Symmetry: C3
Subunit: 485 residues, 3 copies
Amino acid sequence: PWHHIENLDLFFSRVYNLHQKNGFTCMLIGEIFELMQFLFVVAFTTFLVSCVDYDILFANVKVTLPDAFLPAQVCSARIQENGSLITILVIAGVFWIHRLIKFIYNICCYWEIHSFYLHALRIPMSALPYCTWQEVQARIVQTQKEHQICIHKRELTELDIYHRILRFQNYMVALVNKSLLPLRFRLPGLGEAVFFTRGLKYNFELILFWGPGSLFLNEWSLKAEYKRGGQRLELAQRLSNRILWIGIANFLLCPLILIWQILYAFFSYAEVLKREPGALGARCWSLYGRCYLRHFNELEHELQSRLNRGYKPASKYMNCFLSPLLTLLAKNGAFFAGSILAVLIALTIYDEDVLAVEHVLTTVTLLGVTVTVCRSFIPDQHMVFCPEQLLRVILAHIHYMPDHWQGNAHRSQTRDEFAQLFQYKAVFILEELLSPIVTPLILIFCLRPRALEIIDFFRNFTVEVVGVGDTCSFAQMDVRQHGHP
Amino acid sequence: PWHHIENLDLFFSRVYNLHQKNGFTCMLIGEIFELMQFLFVVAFTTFLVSCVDYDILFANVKVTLPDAFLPAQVCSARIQENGSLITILVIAGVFWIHRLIKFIYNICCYWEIHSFYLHALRIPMSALPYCTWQEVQARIVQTQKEHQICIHKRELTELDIYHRILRFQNYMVALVNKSLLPLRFRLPGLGEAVFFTRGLKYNFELILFWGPGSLFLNEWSLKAEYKRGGQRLELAQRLSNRILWIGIANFLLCPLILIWQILYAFFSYAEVLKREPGALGARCWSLYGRCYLRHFNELEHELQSRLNRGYKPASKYMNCFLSPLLTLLAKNGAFFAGSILAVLIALTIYDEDVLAVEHVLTTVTLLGVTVTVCRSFIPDQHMVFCPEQLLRVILAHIHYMPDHWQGNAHRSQTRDEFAQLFQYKAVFILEELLSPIVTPLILIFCLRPRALEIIDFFRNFTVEVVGVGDTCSFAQMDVRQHGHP
Amino acid sequence: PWHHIENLDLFFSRVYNLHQKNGFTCMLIGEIFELMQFLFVVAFTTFLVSCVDYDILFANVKVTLPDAFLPAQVCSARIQENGSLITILVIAGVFWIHRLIKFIYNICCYWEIHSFYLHALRIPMSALPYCTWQEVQARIVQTQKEHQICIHKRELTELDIYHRILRFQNYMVALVNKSLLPLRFRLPGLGEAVFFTRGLKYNFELILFWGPGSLFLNEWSLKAEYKRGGQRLELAQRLSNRILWIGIANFLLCPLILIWQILYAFFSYAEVLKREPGALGARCWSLYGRCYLRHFNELEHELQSRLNRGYKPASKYMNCFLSPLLTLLAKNGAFFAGSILAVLIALTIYDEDVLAVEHVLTTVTLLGVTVTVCRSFIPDQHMVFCPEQLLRVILAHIHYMPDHWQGNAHRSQTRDEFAQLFQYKAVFILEELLSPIVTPLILIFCLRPRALEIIDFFRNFTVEVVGVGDTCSFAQMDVRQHGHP
């Protein structure tokens, strides 16, 4: 069965993804919960908008929750008459239908990879989470005589698998590291800003790689017309038109994606603010820092291990920069809020009839939230300052650092350039919210004029590895730093 | 006064226990609080069952708590007519009376050890928590001419004290490490299971060591009839009858012990679930792992130091095994629960009349508990994987590891064999609850057929150390690994 | 402009303080918030005492908070008739007026230091938090030809700046380390007690350094009459009279300072007890431990770095001393409180009409506080004991240790002598509350008889550094230990 594949790229990608997902049942269950998350968000928002009445809920015999819920018939009648809501529900239904169809198609293709694991590799589905990827790669390459997946090429090699899995991630790394994509901007009051989100990356990959109109013919060969310099201008113009149309589509879909992002951000993070608002101050490796610190021919887990080992030194380093004004404001606000809250709590404990006064419960809640938020900006008063060994420890893991960082380890310029690789979580969320608004502006006005230069890149930096196909040229662009893959 | 003892075993055990309890007043106070804990549990459960009425409490002018409490006379009348409760109270009273009498007898014997510390050793009761056991041992052995506790033997030795204190723990170690006790079982759906609890250990020590019918004549000499192989079968049969009778007694007492265990588990752990349910996921060294990693002639603190030093590497190692399905379920349940709880909290903050709706407070409480529980199964997303150095660091402390562990440090078999030495806290509680049910079945059906082999052990592995008595043979059974006492 | 200063001591102190405060705007904002803190405390306490009525608040249609607030006119009438409150308000107003006038005067003098930073040093106010003090010192000393601040002395030196900033802190260090100040006391039931607070230090510096009647003539020269031994007795008598008058003034002001301290302690710490009572068990370097471990000619940040680096080993060391009785009491109290609270929480969750019973909410709150407090005295059950390497690591940072500490690292005497350098936070607060009561007794009865010896000190241990002035003799008093500045 594993002879007529013709899509070894997708086959190896699935073989890797099924091992990274810890088997088949876990993958199926994750996909099911993703679908259920979307359905639950949509249904819960619609129910909140239509069914509940909020009149007999806000009290304007004890009243139950089911009284505030309208019966099914009148709620359906109120739903089917909104007009501006059924037109959103239709689109959110067709999108979910497309997603469910894609999931149904993916299950029938992942069952075959499950069978390929069970029989061809002799690896049970209960030994996957205990087999490193090197062992699975060795079992793939050494048994390539039985399943005979690739006979055209004389043999199979680990480098062949690395090229098959990472044919487009190498192109993305080379495009980001040669400053061929518009992800640096100058803003008044902020300065340099790196705006790279998931929407922008998805749009770049849709414009350049996927679709029947992209630069790559089938899966592993860019169209031969893109290997001839005699028509640079015409190809650049066609790519510009494609980018313009995709940007127009994004601008049209902007409000739906914005509503979805707002709803998801609320349903996902509006409780962490209440309970533990310090979790949104912890930093994470930005999406640009994942493409800047990535080697060529490096799988996702190989990069994630390095980004994990260098996470605590990076947090320590970014904590070595005291923000004085923020700490002053936090200290004083915490003092005032706690001084009012102590009086409120004492009056509540003495005689509890105070809990019946109107705005006492809300005041206690909001003052507790204020104290908890303010006490999260105050660093540990006894912390050491070693901002020079920390960069050495970090560079020993991430392997990449601009050359003007080793000496001046404590300046204000090094921090403002490391913060683009190691960004806040709140900034991540905030620029995830603004992505559906800014992405069309970036695609229409900023990426479109570069459509010529890109055409040159794919023409000058695409090699032909025998048996694999058209791959990206390796680290000849010595704009980055030390390697050690 | 310290010449006519005749029970040097118990004397040295008390001298060690008074130092391990940080003096005399702390020991007295701990015993008093244990008695008060038992009395409080029983009295509080009886009061909850009988006095309170729960009719005018559940509301079916503001009502006070003392209204729900029945007056003393009617509560006593309701207690003395239950029949199925006074028969439990009588037994719980005679058991507590026996415990209190034992405590009263132990105080009059520990005051003498206090005097022995003050005068014979010249160690004030305020310098005990600052004197290591080596110093107390040296002061015992070097001043053995004044108090002349042991004149029969020519001198006193540290090894003599070690043998006197640990005469039965060595026997327990040798019995557990030679697989002479039934504590490994095969279960459908679980596989290998090590069931070793405090009830089983207490029953083993009662069957073999304590009592006027055990194998040991007075304190330090097993009956001479157990040193002759001419009557192996008769002694095995007598031991089998003894085990059967003790198992029958345990089976009869099963319901009382089960009720006590349920009540104690509720009163002790039902609040940690509410506030911090992650404390019951932290692991601890099981009761079998304390007898498997124990050297011969090793006091309790000498073993506890090693089990403390190797606690954080063991936690790190057991955390290096990601449970994928549990993490998926936890993530999704936390998302859903928090998404509902955020809406509830926002509606509560906006207008607080919502707090009067019937099932809003209970819903908020249960959803908070659900979020807090689910957020305790999600590991740190940035954690390193070094499961090979961790076993080296652990073995450098616990000194014992099966030989097929060093190489294959990340397999599923090594984890399932280390988890029997380092078990969950929730599993500890759960198998503490099932102990009064399973212990009689283990004693009647599993330990009884081995009654012959044990008789051989005590006959072939009991040496006679001069001046000390009948002790267990040392580590000639090379079934374990590296030592270094 | 920077030629006619004549007060280089204050100028260099301000230049250092503006850099330690992270610029000018942060300093201004901190001073403003200090003034606002005082004003807020006074106004809030007066409002609580007078305006609110607590009759219609304790409930003896839903009642609002503004109903309990009396209208402005009747509240002003109730304020202006208290008599025993307006006499406190007048004093708290004149003190705040003096503070505000001092702040207004300090701003007009710190703007000049801001200009001196901007122009003379060419350091923008946005590069201060990224310039170590060594760089600012180098820019001060190397550009001393342009601003020509000090021409009398041939040149300027880093040692000159060190002497100018720390002319009185060296005197305080030498006075504390020669046992010339009464800060050790013998108390029945406690033993040795080191009572050194901020009030005592302020009074010492006011008696000896500041004021027109102190020992120092203008700023940098003690009166020549204090360099002649022909009048030791008369000068000692005059100093004794001065100390007596200052102590009488403190005894008169005692009630106001005591009221202020009580109010500030409540408004600042009465919420940390509720939420996280374990933060008041964490230790901090006492005010005596900051003067005992301080080198000569050592700025505040140079000492704070050492006190920061040696904070975690010191906490570990002070945690290695188990308090047995406290742990027993904490365990048992936590058990009882949690056992009652679990029943209350279960009854609350089952049927919520129980929340309307009178003393259920207060009971739940107080039992939660009790459980949270008791669970803060229980140490980690798996902790290592290495109390000998910890003293080495600590001494490698604090540089000072009595000689009888290295060997006997675990005795009860070493802990009771380290706890005076590393005290609790609760003890700090408690002896901050008792300071206005004990300070006059210490100044009148204990410091006054020493008034002769001090007069000898300033006469025998004051050298004349050329260009700087009268400074304190360096570490010739070899009563302390290893240095390495």
